[PDB]
Amino acid sequence: MNIKEYLGDLIGSSLLITESRIIAESLLKKLPEDEWKSLIVEQNVLQKKSGQTAIRYARTIRWRIEGLGDEFMTDLLAASERAYIQMLMMSLLIHSPVVADFMRHTLAEARRTYKPALTADAWSEFYDTRVRAYAELGGFSDSTIKKMGNNAIKALVDSGYLSDSRTKKIQPVYLMPEVKDWLVRLGREDLIEVMECTI
Template identity: 30%
Template sequence: MAYKADIAGGSLKVYESRIVADLLLKRLPPAEWRQAIEVDNVLQKTSIGTAKRQASLIKTRLKQMTPPLWELVRDGSKPVATQAVFASAIAHSSLLRDFLILHVRDRFLSGDLGLTRSHWRSFVAACHERDPEMSVWSASTTDKLGDSVLRILTEVGMLSDGGKPTLQPVHYEPEVMNYLKDENFDEVLRAMQVFL
């Protein structure tokens, strides 16, 4: 199963994902990729280190999918691009996927739609039981990961933005759903549709 701390500092980053999707579609050789990220600073980051880290995370996420999805990220409306990046993030992170399938789904089923950092902490504790190989994370790492996950759910519209975050269904765009069905991303679809 191998749960990894692979979403820290990673909200969906849709703006940056559009740029990285464009670079992937251009099939740049490594030297040109480095030129774009580190020299031309296409992601407009204040340090090369940040640019490299974000580009690497986004590239790894998007490479879970195929070029037709990269086109949705690059060229789609804001909702299409956001949902396409969300699908990529789920495919990339078993932690995010399982949080949705094992925990968020239960919240929807029970009708108790509040979702906070404490729910994330109890999910991570349960992960240790399921995956004995999982690294032990400090409380601050666990919270940082949880903040990233809650931000992702807020960005895609599954969690309301405000003082008392509440889970809500998402209206997904047909282009994104059709891509995931055609490419047989069943687990990703299941995670995205935990409210059904």
């Protein structure tokens, strides 16, 4: 249990639907990291409030997206809107497995048990599960864990599993074949299951 590998940067960000396109285009330009750094801090293309938060967000989309295909980023930028969102959701699940676990432990259980919606403390119930299993998961302020959950919920809202953040009505979502194939390519078919846990 490495905390950073389990959590990713969920505490800080959700799908990052906007900033991820900018960081995608920049990565395919194969820039010197002189030029790539000035684009982020000096030029400040992410619209951030500080030099370090500009880097924080850039770090996160890089760890999420760069290690996948250099061909991945091409289809990412080339995709339809919901394929773009699905592919971002796919890379979120890879980079923050907590979201995958949350979907198995909570959404699937909700759909298999015929509950039409999640409850407001679904995330915290789930997170307590995880702290019992790995005690270092609870070395955070409550607000951190809540922000982490809000980021998880927004991702599930954004990618179509939940009607909205407030009522959290479970809705069906299907994988597009193009994102299936990237899961087979990445050798992560275990997640096909996860991304259809609401059917």
